[PDB]
Amino acid sequence: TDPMVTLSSILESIINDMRDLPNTYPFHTPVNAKVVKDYYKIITRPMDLQTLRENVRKRLYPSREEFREHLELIVKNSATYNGPKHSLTQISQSMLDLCDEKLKEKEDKLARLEKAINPLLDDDDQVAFSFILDNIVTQKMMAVPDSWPFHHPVNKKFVPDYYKVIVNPMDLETIRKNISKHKYQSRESFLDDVNLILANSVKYNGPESQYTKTAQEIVNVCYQTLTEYDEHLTQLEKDICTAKEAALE
Numbered sequence: 001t002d003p004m005v006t007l008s009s010i011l012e013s014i015i016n017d018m019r020d021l022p023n024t025y026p027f028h029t030p031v032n033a034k035v036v037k038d039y040y041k042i043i044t045r046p047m048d049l050q051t052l053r054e055n056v057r058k059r060l061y062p063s064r065e066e067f068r069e070h071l072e073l074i075v076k077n078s079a080t081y082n083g084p085k086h087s088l089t090q091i092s093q094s095m096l097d098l099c100d101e102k103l104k105e106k107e108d109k110l111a112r113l114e115k116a117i118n119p120l121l122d123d124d125d126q127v128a129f130s131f132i133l134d135n136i137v138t139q140k141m142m143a144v145p146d147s148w149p150f151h152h153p154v155n156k157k158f159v160p161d162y163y164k165v166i167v168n169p170m171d172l173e174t175i176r177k178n179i180s181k182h183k184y185q186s187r188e189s190f191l192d193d194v195n196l197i198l199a200n201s202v203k204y205n206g207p208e209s210q211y212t213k214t215a216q217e218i219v220n221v222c223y224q225t226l227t228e229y230d231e232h233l234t235q236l237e238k239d240i241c242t243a244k245e246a247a248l249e
């Protein structure tokens with residue numbers, strides 16, 4: 001029994017339940033951008049239930065977190081385009097609320113499937129490594145003064161030309177989401193994403209901008225803290241690499 005198949009059946013059943021909620025039809029299929037002519041000038045990451053379902057069938061979601069992140073895009077896009085209190089946004093929120101109810105009902109079964117799909121989710125050294133990285137982001141990097149421009153993805157509605165300049169965006173919330181998915185097995189991949197924040201600031205704001213000085217401070221405190229914990233992090237990375245190669249069945 002392939003655990004990815006079992007997981008995908010669970011996620012598909014949640015989509016069926018969400019589709020059945022009242023007034024949800026505007027979210028069943030992609031927005032038609034030839035009718036909503038300014039949609040892509042406002043929205044960067046379109047999402048809908050049909051695309052979500054086809055992604056499940058493409059086996060793109062190895063865990064509930066990747067699934068839920070795409071589902072939350074439906075709400076975020078509606079809040080941006082239609083408005084935070086618009087009925088469409090309330091409707092989209094009702095779908096996300098139902099998903100969270102179903103995920104909580106099945107949390108123990110989902111945990112077992114997710115660890116069967118990716119054993120590193122159960123590895124104590126991966127969990128400890130990710131916990132340290134998350135604390136560096138929240139306690140050190142997000143605490144840099146005036147670091148707010150880098151905390152969250154840029155909303156195209158408020159910075160309309162941002163993604164015409166920046167094609168590979170990165171922000172601290174996205175890094176935190178990656179940590180919670182245990183995307184990082186060593187400092188190298190983590191530092192690639194951290195440095196993308198700075199590189200994008202140099203490109204969009206310029207090398208001498210106050211925004212870039214803040215991004216430089218964020219990168220520097222990251223290096224400084226990784227150095228302080230270097231002995232511990234090195235042992236974690238070694239033990240993660242051993243566990244990752246033991247997952248060769």
Ligand SMILES: [C]SC1=NC(N2[C][C]O[C][C]2[C])=[C]C(C2([S+](=[N])(=[N])=O)[C][C]2)=N1
Binds near residue numbers: 158201205
């Ligand atoms: C001027 S408003 C703004 N500027 C931002 N940055 C990004 C870094 O370069 C400078 C400037 C373009 C970022 C944000 C976000 S937000 N969701 N509103 O759009 C909080 C994330 N707002």
